[PDB]
Amino acid sequence: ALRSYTEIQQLLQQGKKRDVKNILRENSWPINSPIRAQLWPMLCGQHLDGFYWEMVHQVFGTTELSEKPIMLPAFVDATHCLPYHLTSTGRAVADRIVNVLGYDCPDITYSPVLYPITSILLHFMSEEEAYICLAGLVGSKEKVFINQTKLQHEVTWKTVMQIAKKHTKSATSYFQRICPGLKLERIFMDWCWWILAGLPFQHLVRIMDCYFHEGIKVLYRVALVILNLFHKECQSNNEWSPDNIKNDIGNALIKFCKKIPVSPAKLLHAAFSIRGLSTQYISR
């Protein structure tokens, strides 16, 4: 039997965050489960009743959703406004949310992650609830969820690079070998896109479950796992032989993720097996 929303909400009010953290890690609620409509707005909230629509009005002058394609704020990665399974109306709603966010949060200058997440939220809750999740995450003062400046963006992928150099040293050494002269920076600049634009939606959802509770470290972990799985795969295999991937390891990783050979649960099992990732270690 799987855990339920009200169970977790109780534990949360009591303050058993490790218990909640572990439930989220091990409970693989199906893709259709109604729990996320309730589970996710709470998780995001843990870190104004009609405030959203006020913002909506001030920007667009109306509550009514446009059919005209909406112009996105410059902080979005135009190449990565990943819609996933959102309908045409779903995308238009996403466009409205990020416009509102850009309007109310002027310090967000570069956040290629913000739109893909907005789309994910919209798969399980309403437009206003998605917003309130996002504003919670972005405004988090302790935990980090969504990078908002280009400086933060680059410190982050450099951090991930540093972590990968030790925890998946074989994979990175393997990259340098098959591709001499290659600077690993070019590869890790796109680390989040392995997850957000590679892994199947099914895998993303389970990842979001833990991510909305723990933060960006969950994403760090999954990045390591993908790198290990990709190196293992490269050792004996169809298309991921050195000759086909040396040309572009970058999208070789993306292609590999789209056809990732492990279940969401087996993927998540590896990530949390990884030890030593102290929060102030990654600050060093």
Ligand X SMILES: O=P(O)(O)O[C@@H]1[C@H](O)[C@H](O)[C@@H](OP(=O)(O)O)[C@H](OP(=O)(O)O)[C@H]1O
Q: Dihedral, CA atoms, 246, 249, 251, 253, nearest 10 degrees?
A: 130
111 is in an annotated binding site: no
- Residue 21 CB, nearest approach to ligand X (Å): 6
Which range in 116-124, 187-195, 258-266, 275-283 contacts ligand X by CB under 6 A?
Answer: 275-283
Residue 278 makes contact with ligand X by CB under 6 A? yes
CA distance 30 to 18: 22
| Number of chain positions touching ligand X (CB under 6 A) | 7
Residue 213 makes contact with ligand X by CB under 6 A? no
Closest CA to 230 of 206, 259, 188, 210: 259
CA distance 148 to 270: 29
Residue 275 makes contact with ligand X by CB under 6 A? yes
- Residue 114 CB, nearest approach to ligand X (Å): 23
Residues in the chain, total: 284
Q: How many CB atoms lie within 10 A of CB 165?
A: 14
Q: How many CB atoms lie within 10 A of CB 100?
A: 24
CA distance 177 to 156: 25
Binding residue for ligand X (CB under 6 A) from 73, 217, 225, 230?
Answer: 217
- Residue nearer to ligand X on the CB measure, 126 or 279: 279
- Residue 6 CB, nearest approach to ligand X (Å): 24
- Residue nearer to ligand X on the CB measure, 58 or 279: 279
What is the per-residue DSSP string for 39-104?
A: HHHHHHHT---SHHHHHHHHHHSSSSPPSSPPPPPTTS-GGG---TT--HHHHHHHHHHHHHHHHH
- Residue 99 CB, nearest approach to ligand X (Å): 34
- Residue 280 CB, nearest approach to ligand X (Å): 6
Residue 279 makes contact with ligand X by CB under 6 A? yes
- Residue nearer to ligand X on the CB measure, 80 or 143: 143
Binding residue for ligand X (CB under 6 A) from 30, 180, 181, 276?
Answer: 276
CA distances from 194 to 25, 109, 218 (A): 20, 23, 14
Residue 263 makes contact with ligand X by CB under 6 A? no
- Residue 184 CB, nearest approach to ligand X (Å): 25
- Residue nearer to ligand X on the CB measure, 236 or 273: 273
Residue 144 makes contact with ligand X by CB under 6 A? no
Q: Residue 207: exposed, middle, or buried by beta-carbon count in 10 A (0-12, 13-18, 19+)?
A: buried
279 is in an annotated binding site: yes
Which DSSP letter does residue 105 get? -
Q: Which residues are annotated as a binding site?
A: 21, 25, 217, 221, 275-279
- Chain contacts with ligand X (rule: CB under 6 A): 214, 217, 275-279
